[PDB]
Structures are given as C-alpha cells and as structure tokens.
Amino acid sequence: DFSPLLTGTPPQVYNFNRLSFTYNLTKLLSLFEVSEFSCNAISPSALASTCYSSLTVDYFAFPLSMASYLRPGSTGPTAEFNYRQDFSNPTCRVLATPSSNITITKPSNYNWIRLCRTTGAFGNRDQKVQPGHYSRCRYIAPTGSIYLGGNEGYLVSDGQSASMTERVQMTFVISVTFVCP
Amino acid sequence: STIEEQAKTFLDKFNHEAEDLFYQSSLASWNYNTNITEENVQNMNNAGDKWSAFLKEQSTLAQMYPLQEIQNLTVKLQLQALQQNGSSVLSEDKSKRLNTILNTMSTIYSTGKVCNPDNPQECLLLEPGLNEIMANSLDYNERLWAWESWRSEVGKQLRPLYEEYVVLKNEMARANHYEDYGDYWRGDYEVNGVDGYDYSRGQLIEDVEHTFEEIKPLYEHLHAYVRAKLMNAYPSYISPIGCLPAHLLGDMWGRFWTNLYSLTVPFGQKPNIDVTDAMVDQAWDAQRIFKEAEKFFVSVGLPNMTQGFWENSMLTDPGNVQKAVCHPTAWDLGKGDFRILMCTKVTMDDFLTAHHEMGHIQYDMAYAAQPFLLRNGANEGFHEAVGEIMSLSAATPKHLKSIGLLSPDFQEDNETEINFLLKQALTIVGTLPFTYMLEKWRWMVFKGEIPKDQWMKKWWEMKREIVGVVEPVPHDETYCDPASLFHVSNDYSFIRYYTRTLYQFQFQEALCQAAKHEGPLHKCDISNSTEAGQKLFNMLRLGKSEPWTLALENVVGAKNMNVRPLLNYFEPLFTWLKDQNKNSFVGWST
Numbered sequence: 001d002f003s004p005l006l007t008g009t010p011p012q013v014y015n016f017n018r019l020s021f022t023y024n025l026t027k028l029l030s031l032f033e034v035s036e037f038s039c040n041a042i043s044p045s046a047l048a049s050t051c052y053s054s055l056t057v058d059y060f061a062f063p064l065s066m067a068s069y070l071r072p073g074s075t076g077p078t079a080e081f082n083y084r085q086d087f088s089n090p091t092c093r094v095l096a097t098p099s100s101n102i103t104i105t106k107p108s109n110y111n112w113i114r115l116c117r118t119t120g121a122f123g124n125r126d127q128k129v130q131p132g133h134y135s136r137c138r139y140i141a142p143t144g145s146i147y148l149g150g151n152e153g154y155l156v157s158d159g160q161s162a163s164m165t166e167r168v169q170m171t172f173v174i175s176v177t178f179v180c181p
Numbered sequence: 182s183t184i185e186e187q188a189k190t191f192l193d194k195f196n197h198e199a200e201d202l203f204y205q206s207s208l209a210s211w212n213y214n215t216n217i218t219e220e221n222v223q224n225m226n227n228a229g230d231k232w233s234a235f236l237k238e239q240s241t242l243a244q245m246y247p248l249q250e251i252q253n254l255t256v257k258l259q260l261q262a263l264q265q266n267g268s269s270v271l272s273e274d275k276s277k278r279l280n281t282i283l284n285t286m287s288t289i290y291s292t293g294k295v296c297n298p299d300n301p302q303e304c305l306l307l308e309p310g311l312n313e314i315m316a317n318s319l320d321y322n323e324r325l326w327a328w329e330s331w332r333s334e335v336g337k338q339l340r341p342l343y344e345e346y347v348v349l350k351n352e353m354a355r356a357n358h359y360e361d362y363g364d365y366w367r368g369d370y371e372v373n374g375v376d377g378y379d380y381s382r383g384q385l386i387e388d389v390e391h392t393f394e395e396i397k398p399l400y401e402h403l404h405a406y407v408r409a410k411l412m413n414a415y416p417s418y419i420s421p422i423g424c425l426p427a428h429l430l431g432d433m434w435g436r437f438w439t440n441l442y443s444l445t446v447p448f449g450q451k452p453n454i455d456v457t458d459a460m461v462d463q464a465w466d467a468q469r470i471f472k473e474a475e476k477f478f479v480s481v482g483l484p485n486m487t488q489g490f491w492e493n494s495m496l497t498d499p500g501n502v503q504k505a506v507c508h509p510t511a512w513d514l515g516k517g518d519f520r521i522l523m524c525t526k527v528t529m530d531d532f533l534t535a536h537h538e539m540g541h542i543q544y545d546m547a548y549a550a551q552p553f554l555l556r557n558g559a560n561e562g563f564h565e566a567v568g569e570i571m572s573l574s575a576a577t578p579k580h581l582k583s584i585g586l587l588s589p590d591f592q593e594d595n596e597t598e599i600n601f602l603l604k605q606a607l608t609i610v611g612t613l614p615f616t617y618m619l620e621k622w623r624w625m626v627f628k629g630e631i632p633k634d635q636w637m638k639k640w641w642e643m644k645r646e647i648v649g650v651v652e653p654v655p656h657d658e659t660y661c662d663p664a665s666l667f668h669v670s671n672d673y674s675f676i677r678y679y680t681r682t683l684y685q686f687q688f689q690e691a692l693c694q695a696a697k698h699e700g701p702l703h704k705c706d707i708s709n710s711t712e713a714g715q716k717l718f719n720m721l722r723l724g725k726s727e728p729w730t731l732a733l734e735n736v737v738g739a740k741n742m743n744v745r746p747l748l749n750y751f752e753p754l755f756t757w758l759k760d761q762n763k764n765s766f767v768g769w770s771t
C-alpha cells in the first residue's frame with residue numbers, strides 16, 4: 001500500500017522515510033508528473049512486471065532544479081550529505097510531481113543539509129552519507145551544531161533553503177532485491 | 182585542567198566560530214565581485230568588519246595559552262598564527278597613523294594620473310593608459326616620457342609617506358620581537374621545533390643569494406641576447422657592453438620581459454603554437470575548456486570538481502545584466518565551497534588559465550580537512566607554484582595533441598622548442614633578478630643598512646649591478662621608484678615570486694621523474710601519470726600542518742629550495758643562447 005507515500009507531507013531529503021514492502025506501479029506513477037526516470041541495472045519496463053524478494057521505495061521532497069546533486073557520481077556539498085543512492089541492487093530514481101487531481105500536503109520550503117562536517121582543533125572531517133543511511137546531522141538539520149567533545153569537537157551542520165514551487169517536487173528511489181505484481 | 186586541554190578546547194571553539202564567519206565573509210565578497218551594487222559592497226564591508234573583530238578578539242584571547250607548554254604540533258601551530266599581534270602592538274595613535282599612511286599610499290597608486298600641459302583633459306592613468314605605452318610602443322622618447330612621468334608624478338609624492346610607513350612598520354616589528362619588518366616578512370619561512378626540518382629567518386637571505394648566484398649565468402646570457410636584439414630596435418640608445426634602459430623592458434618597471442618577445446623572437450618565420458583557431462572551429466565554449474581542465478586533473482589522479490563548483494561558479498561574462506570583476510581567481514569560500522571566477526574567452530591563454538586556476542582549487546580541496554588556520558600552502562610560495570605547474574604541462578604540445586587541439590602531424594622541431602623556451606625565459610628567468618633585487622633593497626632598507634638619504638642611490642646601484650638595468654635619466658632623492666610598483670606601495674612581500682619560481686620547476690622535475698618522462702623536461706606533461714598525482718597530493722593535503730621543508734621533501738626529495746630543476750628546464754635554450762652569444766659580450770658594465 002503506497003498510501004503513506006501519497007498521503008501526508010513529504011519529508012525533507014535528510015529526513016527521508018523508507019517504505020519497505022515484502023502491486024500496480026502503472027497506477028502509482030500515473031498520478032505523478034514523472035520528469036526523470038533513471039533506472040540503473042534494470043529496465044524501466046521490467047520494474048512493474050517482476051517478482052521481488054523485497055521492495056523498498058525511498059521518498060522525500062527535493063526541488064527539480066537541485067536534482068543534479070542526487071545524480072550518481074556527484075560529489076561535494078548537497079551531493080553526499082543528504083542522501084546517497086544504493087547501487088548494490090538495481091535501482092530506479094524517479095523525480096516527479098503529484099498531479100493536480102491528487103491532493104498533496106505542501107511543506108514550508110525545501111530544506112537540505114548543504115554540509116554536515118565535524119570541526120574542531122584538529123580539522124574538519126566530513127560526515128558523508130552511507131548508501132541507505134542518514135547523515136548523522138538528521139536531528140540538527142538543516143543548520144545547527146552540537147558539542148560531541150574530544151578530538152572530534154563540534155558537529156557542524158550547514159543547511160540550505162529554496163522557495164518551493166506551487167506544487168511539491170518529490171524524489172522516489174526504488175530498490176528491489178532478488179513482491180509480485 | 183591542563184594547559185594543553187584548555188588550549189585544545191579554546192581552538193575547538195575558535196574553529197567552530199571561525200568556519201561560519203569566514204564563510205559568511207567569503208559569500209559576501211563573492212556576491213560583491215560577481216554582481217557589483219551598493220548593497221552588496223556594504224554587505225561585504227559588514228562581513229569583513231565582523232570577521233576582523235572576531236579575529237582580533239580571538240587573538241587577544243589566544244595569548245593566555247603559552248607556546249612552551251603546548252606539546253601537540255597542530256595546537257602549537259594554530260596558536261602561533263593566533264597570537265601574532267601585529268599592528269595591535271602599536272598604540273592607537275600609531276595604528277591609526279599607519280593605517281592612514283597605507284590608505285593614502287594605496288589611493289595614490291590606484292589613482293595615478295598623468296597628462297602633459299598640452300591637454301589637461303586627456304589625462305592618462307596606469308591601467309590601461311601607460312601600460313599600453315610601456316607594453317606596445319616602440320618609441321624611445323614616448324616610453325621615456327611614460328616612464329619619467331609615472332615615476333615623478335606618483336613616486337615623487339609617495340616618498341615621505343613611504344618613509345613614515347617604514348618607520349612605523351619597523352616600530353611595530355621590533356615591538357613584536359623581530360629584528361625589523363624584513364625579519365617579520367621572512368618569518369613565513371621560519372620552521373622551529375622539528376628535528377632535521379628547521380629553517381631560520383636569516384637562512385632565507387643566504388639561500389636566495391646562493392640560488393641567484395647559481396641562476397646568474399643563464400640570466401646574463403639571456404640579458405646579452407635581449408640587449409643585442411634591442412640594439413636593432415634602438416640603434417643609438419643601447420651600448421653593446423652596457424646595461425639595458427629601464428623603459429625598454431616591455432613594461433613599466435621591467436618586472437617581466439614578456440612584451441619583448443616580438444623584438445627578441447629567435448625564429449620569426451616559424452609561428453608559435455596557438456590552438457585558439459582549433460577551439461574556434463571545434464566550438465569550444467567555457468564549459469568545454471573547464472571540463473578539459475578537469476579531465477586533465479582527473480587523468481593525473483586528482484579528484485574531479487564538485488557539483489557545487491559547476492553551479493555556483495560562473496565561468497562566462499554575465500553581460501550588462503550585472504557588472505562583474507572577472508580577473509581570473511580561485512575561491513575557497515570555506516565549508517566545502519570552491520568557485521572559479523573568470524571571463525573565459527576562446528583563447529589559448531584562457532585555456533591555460535583554466536588549468537592554472539583549476540590547480541589552485543585542487544590545493545584547497547586537498548587541504549580542506551585541515552584546521553582553518555592551517556588551510557594554506559606550506560609557505561607563501563607553494564600555492565602559486567602549484568598553480569603554475571599545471572599550465573606548464575597544459576601548454577605542452579603532447580597534451581595539445583592528445584585532446585585534439587593540435588594536429589597530430591604537427592612538426593615539433595628544435596626551432597619551435599627554442600622559440601617556446603625563449604618566450605618562457607622572458608617571463609620566468611627575466612623576473613628573478615628583478616624580484617631578488619627588490620626584496621634585497623626592501624630587506625636592508627627595513628634593516629637600516631640604507632639611510633633615507635641613500636635610498637634612490639642604492640636602489641639604482643642595485644638595478645645596474647644585480648639586474649643590469651640603467652636609469653634613462655638620473656634621479657635624486659625625492660623620487661620613490663620602488664613605490665611606483667603595486668606591491669611596494671601596497672605592503673606586499675615580493676620574495677614569494679622568487680621561491681615560487683624555484684618551487685615550480687622543482688615540482689615539475691619531481692613529477693615528470695615520477696611520470697617516467699623521457700626527453701627534455703620542457704616537453705613534459707604529467708597527464709595519465711597517477712604516480713605523479715599521488716606525490717603531488719601527498720604534499721597538497723598537508724596544508725600548513727607540516728613544515729614547508731618537509732612538504733618540499735615529500736615531492737622533490739630535498740628539504741631546501743633548489744635551482745638545478747630550473748636550469749634543467751632551460752637547458753636547450755642555455756646552449757642555444759651560449760652559441761648565439763659567441764660573438765657578443767656577456768655581462769654588463771657599470
């Protein structure tokens with residue numbers, strides 16, 4: 001049931017909610033204005049016509065103009081500190097926007113961690129995001145800082161904001177493992 | 182409760198509060214430079230004032246922790262830079278007087294203005310008025326006028342201001358536990374507390390003198406060749422065995438001999454390599470040029486550019502929608518932000534400038550993991566030397582033949598090699614005696630070895646002796662010719678441009694040897710050579726965390742600045758120059 005994906009305010013990318021199912025994707029993608037459908041190691045035709053041991057759909061809100069940072073191989077701020085795609089299994093990254101006939105909750109704006117590093121007397125260690133995990137700055141995002149203490153020092157989180165459009169633009173990272181249609 | 186722990190937590194707090202403020206100041210300055218308005222400049226000044234106030238407040242707070250008790254090298258090195266009081270040592274009246282003197286000197290240089298009585302409304306300033314005369318004109322009288330007017334209308338009025346500036350700077354330096362201001366400037370190369378890697382402040386003078394003594398034969402041969410070539414352009418103005426007039430050196434001060442290439446080209450029939458037409462015909466925009474530079478750096482082994490570099494950095498002139506100061510600069514804004522600001526045009530000079538500025542950013546991405554105070558080059562000459570070696574390989578015809586910018590059937594012969602080497606030596610070898618001379622003069626004017634009544638006599642004696650340059654018209658002691666230069670009148674050390682030139686060929690020889698390059702060193706590119714990129718990165722990633730001697734040894738295997746790599750680079754030209762000077766006099770008569 002993909003109702004929580006379509007019902008409720010979409011979270012920010014750093015606070016993405018993962019929905020694991022252990023289906024009719026034609027209907028699910030019919031009511032989103034799919035702008036980009038980048039499928040890795042799997043055809044865009046076979047994702048809805050194959051049985052899977054386990055299916056995961058990570059969904060979060062992220063602007064379309066900033067989607068170049070979530071592309072594979074991107075590095076630096078906003079590219080490795082919010083979410084990292086897991087390429088161990090075949091993936092399908094979908095950048096879409098819900099259609100007008102469907103109602104979606106609209107958050108205040110788009111928020112993401114531009115850079116979550118650990119500064120101190122011995123330097124700044126970047127706390128990059130592991131594939132499928134969070135940024136360690138999730139609870140202090142987008143902008144904040146705490147005192148870990150010791151060699152690490154201060155956990156500094158630097159965020160960014162963007163004025164969101166008339167409708168939310170949401171990213172879906174679909175991952176399957178080797179759930180029948 | 183230990184002093185070490187107190188210093189460590191103080192530096193923790195300082196680094197936490199300095200990354201945000203420095204990033205805010207950098208963002209404000211970048212917004213000003215990218216788009217000049219009245220609000221953006223005011224935001225820039227507010228951010229700079231806040232950053233300076235924070236820096237002063239943390240510097241006064243830093244003196245509580247003594248250096249002798251701190252054991253960690255990182256903490257000690259951060260505290261060293263934090264407790265440098267500087268102008269704060271001087272009293273409020275003295276500090277205000279020094280700042281005012283610097284401000285008037287800088288404004289006098291910036292608004293330098295020249296006009297003959299024949300047209301008081303047709304006045305010419307330095308940029309680009311007199312620069313064009315000094316760089317392009319071929320008239321002895323016109324260049325002499327543009328030289329004397331600039332050194333008698335601007336330099337003549339900086340003399341008492343420069344004397345007071347020297348007095349105040351010596352006061353500040355000696356009150357800061359230095360011998361004089363020259364010792365304070367040389368303190369950048371000082372290393373203490375590291376066994377086998379120590380460097381003294383006074384050792385820099387001896388090393389620079391020794392390296393210049395080793396440079397001198399090549400410079401003398403190049404000077405003789407340039408004098409012989411200029412004798413054909415000014416038949417009745419240059420003596421065969423004498424010095425070179427100061428106004429016939431291709432620019433105002435003779436800092437670079439680049440604009441003398443047209444007169445001193447060895448083989449004018451054979452044209453130099455220029456791939457501008459190739460990129461015009463292949464439709465190479467700014468994005469393609471910078472992606473080619475990124476491909477070069479990745480092939481070397483260094484990381485590719487960040488995504489934010491490709492969206493937050495503007496590489497083309499925005500037009501009239503927003504005025505922009507697009508002098509090509511690299512920007513380490515802090516907090517992982519790197520941006521190149523330049524008006525890229527389809528030209529080989531802008532193609533090599535892309536590699537040059539790309540190499541400045543790579544150093545920043547390398548040491549971005551260092552503490553804020555240690556995020557710099559090992560010394561003041563490391564950063565620009567690292568930048569300058571990336572354009573050495575980029576301009577190599579092998580690199581141009583690998584990216585398709587040069588015809589694969591292009592005939593690289595000895596004539597083109599000599600032309601390229603002469604062009605390189607005009608800008609590189611010709612600026613070393615000038616830099617050494619200027620820094621020596623400043624060093625022992627600050628030291629008090631030259632009385633204020635002997636400033637202009639000693640300066641021109643240095644010009645005739647070290648550089649072989651004779652003044653067109655004698656100058657008594659109201660002029661300030663050194664102050665006619667930007668760095669002298671704007672309080673900038675000049676030796677960074679000497680050591681860099683010796684570091685740049687030290688790295689290139691070390692990297693090429695790591696690249697298993699066979700043949701002349703000037704025909705070397707470090708492309709597709711990970712063994713050279715690793716050696717470069719092992720020094721780049723350190724920052725100021727390790728002594729510049731150790732950082733040098735990490736690449737070149739030697740602890741000290743050396744000149745043999747520089748002389749090896751110009752070896753094909755040195756033999757050709759020696760053959761060309763068999764029937765001429767090498768050296769100048771004073």
Ligand SMILES: CC(=O)N[C@@H]1[C@@H](O)[C@H](O)[C@@H](CO)O[C@H]1O
Pocket residue numbers: 072073074476479485
């Ligand atoms: C030219 C360049 O730097 N490409 C990079 C490199 O990491 C790799 O070629 C690929 C990653 O799979 O895409 C980019 O991230």
Ligand SMILES: CC(=O)N[C@@H]1[C@@H](O)[C@H](O)[C@@H](CO)O[C@H]1O
Pocket residue numbers: 216218220
């Ligand atoms: C074209 C454009 O968007 N300019 C913006 C705008 O905020 C304003 O015109 C000015 C600041 O007041 O400079 C930039 O920040």
Ligand SMILES: CC(=O)N[C@@H]1[C@@H](O)[C@H](O)[C@@H](CO)O[C@H]1O
Pocket residue numbers: 244264266270
């Ligand atoms: C550690 C150290 O040398 N501090 C000096 C010293 O003259 C004094 O502690 C203070 C000036 O009042 O600040 C510095 O100039």
Ligand SMILES: CC(=O)N[C@@H]1[C@@H](O)[C@H](O)[C@@H](CO)O[C@H]1O
Pocket residue numbers: 122151253254255
């Ligand atoms: C380069 C250096 O001096 N490192 C030391 C070392 O004790 C350790 O690497 C770390 C603390 O765990 O930071 C410094 O205290």
Ligand SMILES: CC(=O)N[C@@H]1[C@@H](O)[C@H](O)[C@@H](CO)O[C@H]1O
Pocket residue numbers: 316317440443
């Ligand atoms: C340094 C110099 O004299 N260059 C000349 C000059 O006429 C101009 O700079 C350009 C012509 O476009 O190239 C050369 O002919």
Ligand SMILES: CC(=O)N[C@@H]1[C@@H](O)[C@H](O)[C@@H](CO)O[C@H]1O
Pocket residue numbers: 580583584708709
């Ligand atoms: C400098 C160099 O050796 N480059 C080689 C060359 O085969 C070509 O320039 C290109 C092929 O794509 O990249 C490398 O393989």
